[PDB]
Amino acid sequence: HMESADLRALAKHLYDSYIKSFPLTKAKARAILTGKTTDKSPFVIYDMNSLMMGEDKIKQSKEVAIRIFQGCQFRSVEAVQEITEYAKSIPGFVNLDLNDQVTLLKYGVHEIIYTMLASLMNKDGVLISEGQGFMTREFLKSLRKPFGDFMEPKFEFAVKFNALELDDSDLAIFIAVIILSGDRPGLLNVKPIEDIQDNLLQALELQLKLNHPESSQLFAKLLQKMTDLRQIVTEHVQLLQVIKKTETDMSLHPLLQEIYKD
Amino acid sequence: HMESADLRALAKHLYDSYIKSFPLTKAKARAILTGKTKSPFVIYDMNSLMMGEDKIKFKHITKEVAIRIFQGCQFRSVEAVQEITEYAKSIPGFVNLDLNDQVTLLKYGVHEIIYTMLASLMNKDGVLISEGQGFMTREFLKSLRKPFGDFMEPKFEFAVKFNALELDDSDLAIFIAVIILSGDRPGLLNVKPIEDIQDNLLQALELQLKLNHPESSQLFAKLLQKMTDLRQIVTEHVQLLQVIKKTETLHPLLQEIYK
Ligand SMILES: COc1ccc(COc2cc(C(=O)O)ccc2-c2nn(C(=O)c3c(Cl)cccc3C(F)(F)F)c3ccc(Cl)cc23)cc1
Ligand SMILES: COc1ccc(COc2cc(C(=O)O)ccc2-c2nn(C(=O)c3c(Cl)cccc3C(F)(F)F)c3ccc(Cl)cc23)cc1
């Protein structure tokens, strides 16, 4: 459909914007996690005592599980802002009907947050504070009530997603494909969204073949991962609903508040 | 990896087996639904249902109307499970898998393939039954009482979207094989040969769709997306089965047949 020279151009464009939009890349996260460096090592939070020191080292007086939860939402709000900025760079997105732009972001940001959170994860924990900290999976799993169960499904996905060994240039196109989904509820003009997604899919297909030439059917394996993404988002909102019934003492950021309607 | 000549041979092998395994193909069903070919008996309300149960030889009649139709769906699904089980044995490599893994793949796969293949029998207005001798309207099914009406309509809602892809039987034979060989089913013992086979099936499906739908850009990717959806739809489906088989409280022996 599109000449390969044009598909390579689209990949370069999107990769360029991804670097401009997202401060902590997968390449940087892997350098921090795999060590070999003395200037990039994170402070590790694994228990109540190391958390207390972490607030002093890495530089709102409530229960611990609460404090950590609000820390996540703060970062999620930032991610939404970064993702919104990235989507405006996707060719054709800002030319869509304005209601559809909103609709695509509303149902797209969480699937992308989960995708990109995997970059910050290994089987034992997750980078935080722009990579200055690292909080262990075990510590997250041991938080009380429903909060302990919140964090773990992210990890089971990440371990599976990370086995695909995608780099940032692959992820930049995958993320674009997620945003331009014509099956979001309430879309007004499905067809121009599908046309954009077709080009992005072509670009993702060629990128994955060139960048992982010994990785057979990686394109198909990557698309199937959108199953896993859909299931965790559902688990996530369902757990939020429980919290929005036990903890009437707290609420969400207006941006998250509006995202989670319908 | 696989030579193109080998992928076509695999596509042909699967097509031939699919034609032998399934009584009513998509091509035959489309002929019936479009009137392009003895008209099927139409069930559109309570009175014609009663006549249809007499004229058509329903094998499942042993209660309330909405119940009876539900039991017919179950009867036909149990039939389909055996038809799919027979088809999977023709998939190159399947019978050499560990026997527990063969069972596991079928246990979690049949529901997705039944939904997929039910689309072949559907249009926006109803569904073929009894090997195409009957046709029950969408409207009559949607209007069934308590949860039964909302049970039937999601099948149609999927089918309308899936059918816009305009796959034919030779496309579907490979797609069905791909679903069966899913290496992420829980409880699998030896994932590697399952993913290896699926890798070859995926190669064959990609080539089939390019030759058979050369004007249909990224149809391969679009179909893979539908395999995703199927996962969520089956989950909603089974949950509703649990409710219907719990809120709508027959014989213990029939209960075991439909476990
Ligand atoms: C103590 O300090 C911190 C501690 C943890 C974090 C979380 O790390 C993330 C990083 C990014 C990043 O950097 O892109 C992005 C997300 C998180 C993160 N969100 N989240 C949530 O529950 C969440 C999500 Cl997904 C989406 C919307 C709303 C929410 C929330 F409202 F319900 F909260 C997580 C749950 C578990 C884990 Cl392990 C990570 C996340 C940040 C700082
Ligand atoms: C006299 O009444 C009828 C007799 C036969 C039919 C034909 O129905 C099918 C045919 C095939 C065929 O021929 O390939 C295949 C499927 C059905 C059919 N399954 N199904 C289900 O709920 C269902 C499904 Cl999807 C998957 C797994 C298990 C089940 C079940 F266990 F929960 F049942 C339906 C729901 C609605 C409709 Cl409209 C059709 C189906 C319809 C009505």
From Swiss-Prot, chain A:
Q: Does the keyword Ion transport apply?
A: no
Biological source species: Homo sapiens (Human)
Annotated localization: Nucleus; Cytoplasm
**Comment block on domains:** The 9aaTAD motif is a transactivation domain present in a large number of yeast and animal transcription factors.
> What PTMs does it carry?
Phosphorylated in basal conditions and dephosphorylated when treated with the ligand. May be dephosphorylated by PPP5C.
GO molecular function per UniProt: alpha-actinin binding; arachidonate binding; chromatin binding; DNA binding; DNA binding domain binding; DNA-binding transcription activator activity, RNA polymerase II-specific; DNA-binding transcription factor activity; DNA-binding transcription factor activity, RNA polymerase II-specific
Q: Which residues of the full protein are shown?
A: 235 to 503 of 505
Q: In which tissues is it expressed?
A: Highest expression in adipose tissue. Lower in skeletal muscle, spleen, heart and liver. Also detectable in placenta, lung and ovary.
Summarizing the annotation, the consequence of altering residue 73 to P is:
In colon cancer; sporadic; somatic mutation; loss of ligand-binding
Q: What is this protein called?
A: Peroxisome proliferator-activated receptor gamma
Functionally, this protein is described as follows: Nuclear receptor that binds peroxisome proliferators such as hypolipidemic drugs and fatty acids. Once activated by a ligand, the nuclear receptor binds to DNA specific PPAR response elements (PPRE) and modulates the transcription of its target genes, such as acyl-CoA oxidase. It therefore controls the peroxisomal beta-oxidation pathway of fatty acids. Key regulator of adipocyte differentiation and glucose homeostasis. ARF6 acts as a key regulator of the tissue-specific adipocyte P2 (aP2) enhancer.
**Region annotation (Interaction with FAM120B) ranges:** 3-48
Q: Which gene encodes it?
A: PPARG
Indicate the quaternary assembly: Interacts with FOXO1 (acetylated form). Heterodimer with other nuclear receptors, such as RXRA. The heterodimer with the retinoic acid receptor RXRA is called adipocyte-specific transcription factor ARF6. Interacts with NCOA6 coactivator, leading to a strong increase in transcription of target genes. Interacts with coactivator PPARBP, leading to a mild increase in transcription of target genes. Interacts with NOCA7 in a ligand-inducible manner. Interacts with NCOA1 and NCOA2 LXXLL motifs. Interacts with ASXL1, ASXL2, DNTTIP2, FAM120B, MAP2K1/MEK1, NR0B2, PDPK1, PRDM16, PRMT2 and TGFB1I1.
Provide the disease association from the record: Defects in PPARG can lead to type 2 insulin-resistant diabetes and hyptertension. PPARG mutations may be associated with colon cancer. Obesity: A condition characterized by an increase of body weight beyond the limitation of skeletal and physical requirements, as the result of excessive accumulation of body fat.
List this protein's GO terms for biological process. BMP signaling pathway; cell differentiation; cell fate commitment; cell maturation; cellular response to hypoxia; cellular response to insulin stimulus; cellular response to low-density lipoprotein particle stimulus; epithelial cell differentiation
Q: Does the keyword Transcription regulation apply?
A: yes
Q: Where is this cross-link: Glycyl lysine isopeptide (Lys-Gly) (interchain with G-Cter in ubiquitin)?
A: 20
Swiss-Prot record, chain B:
Keyword Ribonucleoprotein among record annotations: no
So which tissues is this one expressed in? Highest expression in adipose tissue. Lower in skeletal muscle, spleen, heart and liver. Also detectable in placenta, lung and ovary.
Activity regulation, in the record's words, is: PDPK1 activates its transcriptional activity independently of its kinase activity.
What's the chief localization of this chain?
Answer: nucleus
Conditions for induction: (Microbial infection) Expression increases when incubated with M.tuberculosis or its lipoprotein LpqH; induction is TLR2-dependent (at protein level).
Protein location? Nucleus; Cytoplasm
Entry's free-text remark on domains:
The 9aaTAD motif is a transactivation domain present in a large number of yeast and animal transcription factors.
Q: What is this protein called?
A: Peroxisome proliferator-activated receptor gamma
What organism does the UniProt record list as the source? Homo sapiens
Name the gene that codes for it.
PPARG
Q: Which residues of the whole protein are included?
A: 235 to 502 of 505
